[PDB]
Design an enzyme around this catalytic site. Sequence first.
Site, PDB file in Angstrom:
ATOM      1  N   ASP A 276     -56.665 -46.455 -31.576  1.00 39.93           N
ATOM      2  CA  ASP A 276     -56.587 -46.290 -30.131  1.00 39.93           C
ATOM      3  C   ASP A 276     -56.164 -44.956 -29.546  1.00 39.93           C
ATOM      4  O   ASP A 276     -56.894 -44.359 -28.764  1.00 39.93           O
ATOM      5  CB  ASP A 276     -55.702 -47.370 -29.509  1.00 39.93           C
ATOM      6  CG  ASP A 276     -55.715 -47.309 -27.998  1.00 39.93           C
ATOM      7  OD1 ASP A 276     -56.786 -47.584 -27.412  1.00 39.93           O
ATOM      8  OD2 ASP A 276     -54.673 -46.966 -27.398  1.00 39.93           O
TER       9      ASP A 276
ATOM     10  N   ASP B 260     -51.674 -43.451 -32.343  1.00 39.23           N
ATOM     11  CA  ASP B 260     -51.206 -44.481 -33.266  1.00 39.23           C
ATOM     12  C   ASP B 260     -52.366 -44.969 -34.128  1.00 39.23           C
ATOM     13  O   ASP B 260     -53.451 -44.397 -34.091  1.00 39.23           O
ATOM     14  CB  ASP B 260     -50.622 -45.653 -32.466  1.00 39.23           C
ATOM     15  CG  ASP B 260     -51.632 -46.253 -31.500  1.00 39.23           C
ATOM     16  OD1 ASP B 260     -51.359 -47.330 -30.926  1.00 39.23           O
ATOM     17  OD2 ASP B 260     -52.701 -45.644 -31.305  1.00 39.23           O
TER      18      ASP B 260
ATOM     19  N   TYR C 144     -49.250 -53.340 -24.229  1.00 39.32           N
ATOM     20  CA  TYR C 144     -50.020 -52.175 -24.654  1.00 39.32           C
ATOM     21  C   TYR C 144     -51.282 -52.142 -23.804  1.00 39.32           C
ATOM     22  O   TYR C 144     -51.560 -51.161 -23.101  1.00 39.32           O
ATOM     23  CB  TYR C 144     -50.382 -52.282 -26.139  1.00 39.32           C
ATOM     24  CG  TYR C 144     -49.163 -52.374 -27.045  1.00 39.32           C
ATOM     25  CD1 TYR C 144     -48.757 -53.594 -27.578  1.00 39.32           C
ATOM     26  CD2 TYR C 144     -48.405 -51.238 -27.342  1.00 39.32           C
ATOM     27  CE1 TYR C 144     -47.625 -53.686 -28.394  1.00 39.32           C
ATOM     28  CE2 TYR C 144     -47.265 -51.317 -28.158  1.00 39.32           C
ATOM     29  CZ  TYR C 144     -46.887 -52.539 -28.678  1.00 39.32           C
ATOM     30  OH  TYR C 144     -45.794 -52.614 -29.498  1.00 39.32           O
TER      31      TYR C 144
ATOM     32  N   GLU D  40     -50.171 -37.671 -23.973  1.00 38.84           N
ATOM     33  CA  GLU D  40     -50.776 -38.708 -24.798  1.00 38.84           C
ATOM     34  C   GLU D  40     -52.288 -38.479 -24.804  1.00 38.84           C
ATOM     35  O   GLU D  40     -52.829 -37.862 -23.889  1.00 38.84           O
ATOM     36  CB  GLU D  40     -50.452 -40.097 -24.231  1.00 38.84           C
TER      37      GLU D  40
HETATM   38  O1  LIG Z   1     -52.454 -52.714  -9.058  1.00 41.99           O
HETATM   39  C1  LIG Z   1     -52.912 -51.393  -9.297  1.00 41.99           C
HETATM   40  C2  LIG Z   1     -54.022 -51.377 -10.329  1.00 41.99           C
HETATM   41  O2  LIG Z   1     -53.423 -51.713 -11.601  1.00 41.99           O
HETATM   42  C3  LIG Z   1     -54.359 -51.626 -12.684  1.00 41.99           C
HETATM   43  O3  LIG Z   1     -53.690 -51.918 -13.859  1.00 41.99           O
HETATM   44  C4  LIG Z   1     -52.903 -50.846 -14.411  1.00 41.99           C
HETATM   45  C5  LIG Z   1     -51.451 -51.292 -14.543  1.00 41.99           C
HETATM   46  O4  LIG Z   1     -50.920 -51.548 -13.275  1.00 41.99           O
HETATM   47  C6  LIG Z   1     -50.623 -50.205 -15.234  1.00 41.99           C
HETATM   48  O5  LIG Z   1     -49.343 -50.702 -15.499  1.00 41.99           O
HETATM   49  C7  LIG Z   1     -51.275 -49.748 -16.551  1.00 41.99           C
HETATM   50  S1  LIG Z   1     -50.340 -48.388 -17.316  1.00 41.99           S
HETATM   51  C8  LIG Z   1     -51.109 -48.376 -18.969  1.00 41.99           C
HETATM   52  C9  LIG Z   1     -52.126 -47.238 -19.102  1.00 41.99           C
HETATM   53  O6  LIG Z   1     -53.169 -47.436 -18.191  1.00 41.99           O
HETATM   54  C10 LIG Z   1     -52.679 -47.168 -20.527  1.00 41.99           C
HETATM   55  O7  LIG Z   1     -53.550 -46.084 -20.650  1.00 41.99           O
HETATM   56  C11 LIG Z   1     -51.505 -47.018 -21.497  1.00 41.99           C
HETATM   57  O8  LIG Z   1     -51.958 -46.935 -22.806  1.00 41.99           O
HETATM   58  C12 LIG Z   1     -50.965 -46.613 -23.808  1.00 41.99           C
HETATM   59  C13 LIG Z   1     -50.894 -47.738 -24.843  1.00 41.99           C
HETATM   60  O9  LIG Z   1     -50.427 -48.906 -24.225  1.00 41.99           O
HETATM   61  C14 LIG Z   1     -49.966 -47.355 -26.004  1.00 41.99           C
HETATM   62  O10 LIG Z   1     -50.066 -48.317 -27.012  1.00 41.99           O
HETATM   63  C15 LIG Z   1     -50.340 -45.976 -26.571  1.00 41.99           C
HETATM   64  S2  LIG Z   1     -49.164 -45.435 -27.834  1.00 41.99           S
HETATM   65  O11 LIG Z   1     -50.354 -44.991 -25.529  1.00 41.99           O
HETATM   66  C16 LIG Z   1     -51.323 -45.290 -24.500  1.00 41.99           C
HETATM   67  C17 LIG Z   1     -51.330 -44.114 -23.544  1.00 41.99           C
HETATM   68  O12 LIG Z   1     -52.346 -44.264 -22.563  1.00 41.99           O
HETATM   69  O13 LIG Z   1     -50.652 -48.163 -21.385  1.00 41.99           O
HETATM   70  C18 LIG Z   1     -50.037 -48.267 -20.080  1.00 41.99           C
HETATM   71  C19 LIG Z   1     -49.133 -49.483 -20.121  1.00 41.99           C
HETATM   72  O14 LIG Z   1     -49.840 -50.630 -20.573  1.00 41.99           O
HETATM   73  O15 LIG Z   1     -52.649 -49.375 -16.336  1.00 41.99           O
HETATM   74  C20 LIG Z   1     -53.445 -50.450 -15.789  1.00 41.99           C
HETATM   75  C21 LIG Z   1     -54.890 -49.974 -15.752  1.00 41.99           C
HETATM   76  O16 LIG Z   1     -55.064 -48.909 -14.830  1.00 41.99           O
HETATM   77  C22 LIG Z   1     -55.497 -52.623 -12.475  1.00 41.99           C
HETATM   78  O17 LIG Z   1     -56.417 -52.516 -13.521  1.00 41.99           O
HETATM   79  C23 LIG Z   1     -56.187 -52.339 -11.141  1.00 41.99           C
HETATM   80  O18 LIG Z   1     -57.173 -53.303 -10.911  1.00 41.99           O
HETATM   81  C24 LIG Z   1     -55.160 -52.360 -10.001  1.00 41.99           C
HETATM   82  S3  LIG Z   1     -55.907 -52.003  -8.376  1.00 41.99           S
END
Ligand SMILES: OC[C@H]1O[C@@H](O[C@H]2[C@H](O)[C@@H](O)[C@H](S[C@H]3[C@H](O)[C@@H](O)[C@H](O[C@H]4[C@H](O)[C@@H](O)[C@H](S)O[C@@H]4CO)O[C@@H]3CO)O[C@@H]2CO)[C@H](O)[C@@H](O)[C@@H]1S
Lengths: 613, 612
Positions: free
Chosen positions: A54, A57, A203, A419
């Site tokens: 992904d 990691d 995640y 990242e």
């Molecule tokens: O309500 C507003 C919108 O929210 C959208 O959903 C969001 C969500 O609110 C937000 O918390 C997450 S943050 C997320 C990130 O997007 C990922 O890229 C990131 O990936 C990590 C991964 O989890 C790790 O394992 C690895 S080590 O690193 C990566 C680094 O990117 O994880 C973060 C936490 O899970 O994003 C969501 C998507 O944007 C809704 O989808 C939307 O409809 C609404 S309007």
Amino acid sequence: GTYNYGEALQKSIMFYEFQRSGDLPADKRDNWRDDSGMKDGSDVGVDLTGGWYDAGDHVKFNLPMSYTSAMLAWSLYEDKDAYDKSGQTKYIMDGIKWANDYFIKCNPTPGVYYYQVGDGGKDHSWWGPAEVMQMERPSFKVDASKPGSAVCASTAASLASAAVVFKSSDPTYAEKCISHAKNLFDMADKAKSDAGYTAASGYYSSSSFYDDLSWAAVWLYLATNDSTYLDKAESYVPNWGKEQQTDIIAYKWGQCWDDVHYGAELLLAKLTNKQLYKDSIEMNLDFWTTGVNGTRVSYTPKGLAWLFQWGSLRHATTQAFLAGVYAEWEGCTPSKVSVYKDFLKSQIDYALGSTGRSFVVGYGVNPPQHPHHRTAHGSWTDQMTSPTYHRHTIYGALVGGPDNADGYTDEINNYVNNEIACDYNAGFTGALAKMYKHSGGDPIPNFKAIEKITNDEVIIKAGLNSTGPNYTEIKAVVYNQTGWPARVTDKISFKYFMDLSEIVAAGIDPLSLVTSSNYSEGKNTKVSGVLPWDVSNNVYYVNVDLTGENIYPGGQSACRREVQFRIAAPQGTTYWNPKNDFSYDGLPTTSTVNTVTNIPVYDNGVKVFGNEP
Amino acid sequence: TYNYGEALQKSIMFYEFQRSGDLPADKRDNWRDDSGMKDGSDVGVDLTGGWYDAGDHVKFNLPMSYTSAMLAWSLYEDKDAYDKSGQTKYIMDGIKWANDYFIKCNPTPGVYYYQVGDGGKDHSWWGPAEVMQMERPSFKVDASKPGSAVCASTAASLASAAVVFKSSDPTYAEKCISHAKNLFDMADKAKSDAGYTAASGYYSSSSFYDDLSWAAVWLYLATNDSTYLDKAESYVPNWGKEQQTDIIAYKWGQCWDDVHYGAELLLAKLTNKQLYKDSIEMNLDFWTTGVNGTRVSYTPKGLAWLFQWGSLRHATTQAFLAGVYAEWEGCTPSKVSVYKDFLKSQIDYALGSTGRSFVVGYGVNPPQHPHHRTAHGSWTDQMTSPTYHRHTIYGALVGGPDNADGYTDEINNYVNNEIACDYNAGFTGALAKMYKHSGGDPIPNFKAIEKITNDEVIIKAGLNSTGPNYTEIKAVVYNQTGWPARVTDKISFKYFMDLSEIVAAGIDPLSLVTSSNYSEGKNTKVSGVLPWDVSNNVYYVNVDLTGENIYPGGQSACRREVQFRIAAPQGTTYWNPKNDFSYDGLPTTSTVNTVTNIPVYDNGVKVFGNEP
Ligand SMILES: OC[C@H]1O[C@@H](O[C@H]2[C@H](O)[C@@H](O)[C@H](S[C@H]3[C@H](O)[C@@H](O)[C@H](O[C@H]4[C@H](O)[C@@H](O)[C@H](S)O[C@@H]4CO)O[C@@H]3CO)O[C@@H]2CO)[C@H](O)[C@@H](O)[C@@H]1S
Ligand SMILES: OC[C@H]1O[C@@H](O[C@H]2[C@H](O)[C@@H](O)[C@H](S[C@H]3[C@H](O)[C@@H](O)[C@H](O[C@H]4[C@H](O)[C@@H](O)[C@H](S)O[C@@H]4CO)O[C@@H]3CO)O[C@@H]2CO)[C@H](O)[C@@H](O)[C@@H]1S
Ligand SMILES: [Ca+2]
Ligand SMILES: [Ca+2]
Ligand SMILES: [Ca+2]
Ligand SMILES: [Ca+2]
Ligand SMILES: [Mg+2]
Ligand SMILES: [Mg+2]
Ligand SMILES: [Mg+2]
Ligand SMILES: [Mg+2]
Ligand SMILES: [Mg+2]
Ligand code: NI
């Protein structure tokens, strides 16, 4: 402010090759990634090898993974001319096939779908290269009883879009992709629930699946030409998320792994010419550009459309792609075409270097040097801080990006600005293909990532541990600092050379000297007796064999083996002379070992470090 | 099914956004201001006021007076609906706004100005009313050049206003009557539209005997002088007939060009004669059940469709007449429910029965791109820019769909998406009746104070040319005003520098030479170096644009480019632009971009950007 979109495109595609898990092809163009996750699926008796890790990691998260390949296929579907002209068609197709061959493996029997390989907690708790992971890597699945609509539909979309772009060159593969796409879509459609999608919680938690259902249906329609799927895609629209204070389809976010209704509505507008979808996608694009209904996405002082803290570049460049695709459609509001195309360029240029530096690894001016990535960093001691630099250049990786004020710091543990991940580069690749089509920029011909080895891969450090009138005792420590590729070294041995002319002259059999080991690590370490090397010149040696020891660059104890050995003349004698021994010259006094070059190290009998007399 | 009170409230408010002239201090919006302030100056008469007709700024008195006459008719018929909804004040203010203007248009007996503005010139420019730059000629009719239809239509407006204002303002009612009588006399003596020519191509009149009866009926209600009722009836044989029959026309509907429908409805109620009852019922039947094998077209979704232009205007106006007649004791009993069902069905179609509203700023998915210059608010004389309307013109009823319910909400579709005074006239009356019947509370203390959605005055800049001893800036100020659109003739901006290096070189910062290679406006003045905060070695160059007629009405009109330079002695190399506040981030090219460190002032007040 001129940027080579072609070179950026070829590197963005190459990025995914560095993310590959599994049995890597003989034709790979790098010298630092190798076989890894070779037992993936073994815990459930299914071959689940392949696919892409992904981010920084080694977990295989199928939701963002399938979102990624679906987006790459979309780009190839929209701009094959760009990929053909740039000579990159073969490479993106190989990447699309890499992800989809794995998704096919994950659907071994109808009604069963493996959606993850690896445990987030177990995987993230170790900092080292993919090739030598030692922890368990559990496989997880969803089925009718434990549904995963979002991930199943996202995968169906990837498989279906793969079918669309592969149909012409190999219909048999396209046919196979469609077969699995239909089963996964049916699973997702009937279940309408993410209840069983749990291994990714925290995640890649799924906040929606109706968007994925439409997205998958749209692609199945394009792959099969069966309007049954077009009707299904449209039927889910009323259930898509809406804007909080209205009853309007959501438009204040952007296309991403968790929300694909933006891509679905864009395609539905092109496929049906219906006002609803045209209005919806333009509301989203307008929000990202000129603003709409008194609302607009934030913009940094330097021109980046900033959605929020995590992966700002990922969101901006993905929207740039949708803007580019929509702007070329005849149905786009004429007066908005230029606004959309300017947005595409502005955001892509920000990522490439408009602020004075590139946010793409291995590209442009002052690119990021410390992306949060285990294998590119290449620690051999399970330390994010050692070495202090990245041993490999993971070309094409788009980092998360700056804060809302263009603030950005290039550090390995700035796991928010630095990242890198599959989804971050997905829309980006599409936007780059569009800009290359618009403005060109020549890719590097036959570009490869064959790196120069920058540190000795297997070394030895030594020091004087004890000494007496009749003996020399050495403390030696062999270190596996492999990186091209990181690998287990289980056939290492070393030789300690001596001049025993004084022993022969004293009338003592040089091959009779007692060799011994006071201490050593490893059940297999073996210290030979004295052996001849060049008898005519009285040169002999002691062989220390570590064959069988599974030394690997994954920790302090893991990467090393200490061995203390002694060679002694008869008890009570005083003619032993270590000063004419090749391996004793300059040997560090005291047991504080230092790297030495006169105690040669061999790998399966081949000298790899140090010198012989 | 729908909130009729809110609809009624907004429909009345629509007219407030159409107002021309010196706007009241009690104004409940922050985007309309004084405009057409010189109207009548060409003939030496104050002709300011009235309502702009549609999405343009011409004041066409025929549809304008038709509108106010219809609004007054509604207040006359349903005062109880207005009182209960608390909208009485607002519709009365509207009726008076139009009629005060018609009074001004009748400066002396026998003279009537029927138009202010030229269709050709007015329509050739796309921008807000407040900054119109073109000539707006006044046009009049008199004994030698008659306009019976426009004069009588105005007489009807004035007389109907007198009827509804009599109880609260008897003096104004008398004022309206005095003028109504003079205009009707003009119309009645002339019996010709021969001199009514300035509206050609827009509101050319095809009949005036209908206007004569319509005016006479209202003058009778206002004065109780039987002389007028007799006149009203005398014109009936002169009304248009249905082809090949001696039957009074019944296949069209009440509108600005044909008011015999409203006149016969009123004559039926006033005289109870069969002729009138039969005529209005033939019209209403044609629009509902059909009559003698003929019936107006209906769209699949229920819209009684008369014509391609303003289908909603016709249907909702007929809805109003149906409602009024249905309530009258003389209406055929069996048709009462038929007519009332029609009233509701047509109004509901306009409000949202097809799934969306056709009323701006109301209901579900209302039109977003009505053909209207001031609501759109372009500052570049472009219908296409911005790509959205900067203002919400609440209450506006759009033209309507085609005969198959097809509708395209786009700014350039002026056939199905324009809005206009007459479009909302009958609509307002039908809404009052639906409110009386089904309710729906208006929004309490409703106003249209919008948030400023774009910086009204901005500046873009870039590096024109540099040197080891100088910096030359190219800056462009833009007037993007909208709340309200306005001429910005007191604009200036400041370029800040840190001149510590000059002081350190033993040179007087005030001695540096400032200059300008290019300048768009002829009043552009670039000062020499001035002190701002010498403690921190900050000095600046003041660029004054005061006197420039910068306005949001064209690409060149809304902007002023200024290129200026500041330079140290030739040959010197200590000049350092990097520590200058206004140099930071400055686009290092002749291609300018929006900047925030070269503050813009409006009459000395900083309105854009930051200071050090
Ligand atoms: O309500 C507003 C919108 O929210 C959208 O959903 C969001 C969500 O609110 C937000 O918390 C997450 S943050 C997320 C990130 O997007 C990922 O890229 C990131 O990936 C990590 C991964 O989890 C790790 O394992 C690895 S080590 O690193 C990566 C680094 O990117 O994880 C973060 C936490 O899970 O994003 C969501 C998507 O944007 C809704 O989808 C939307 O409809 C609404 S309007
Ligand atoms: O023959 C049948 C009936 O005809 C009626 O007269 C018609 C006339 O035949 C027809 O051409 C016009 S169409 C007209 C529309 O009514 C106006 O509302 C519209 O206004 C324009 C305005 O002209 C512009 O300046 C502004 S920018 O926009 C507005 C948008 O509404 O203009 C259209 C074209 O001029 O309608 C007449 C009235 O219905 C007779 O009155 C009737 O007796 C006979 S039976
Ligand atoms: Ca989703
Ligand atoms: Ca020796
Ligand atoms: Ca007439
Ligand atoms: Ca300076
Ligand atoms: Mg292999
Ligand atoms: Mg194409
Ligand atoms: Mg729109
Ligand atoms: Mg005033
Ligand atoms: Mg300073
Ligand atoms: Ni560094």
